Design a protein around this ligand. Sequence first.
Ligand SMILES: [Ca+2]
Ligand SMILES: [Ca+2]
Length: 76
Amino acid sequence: HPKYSDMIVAAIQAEKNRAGSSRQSIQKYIKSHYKVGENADSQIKLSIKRLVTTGVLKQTKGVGASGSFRLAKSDE
DNA sequence: GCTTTTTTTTTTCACAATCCCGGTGCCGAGGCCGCTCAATTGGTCGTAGACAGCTCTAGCACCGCTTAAACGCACGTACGGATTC
Ligand SMILES: [Ca+2]
Ligand SMILES: [Ca+2]
């Protein structure tokens, strides 16, 4: 298997559609070829929690925990 | 060679200590139970250190002289240790 910032790239990159990108449609695609452990959902929200704050991923619209994201940082 | 007497050896009577039975009694080892908190699973992230490669410190070897030091022996003193008190 590959890492979870390896997995988060594959869903949003391949197709590009529902709610810009959001939490359910990412986890549906991700499970098909990561091969699911129980920790999948726990370390997929953690991967998002540190990727949104670093600059690799930037968020479109939300409040606190919920929302929707993109890949290209804002103004870049 | 005898006596006497002093020392040492031998036995012969004692007594705490031990052990094996029995029997009894109590409390803490040893196990159970219902948690929870600390080890485990999994993945992410950053650097500690094996490893290769270079430098060049300093550790080893070698020699031949000078003489301080070690070695060995002659000699007798004051020490160690036995004995006695
Ligand atoms: Ca479960
Ligand atoms: Ca280093």
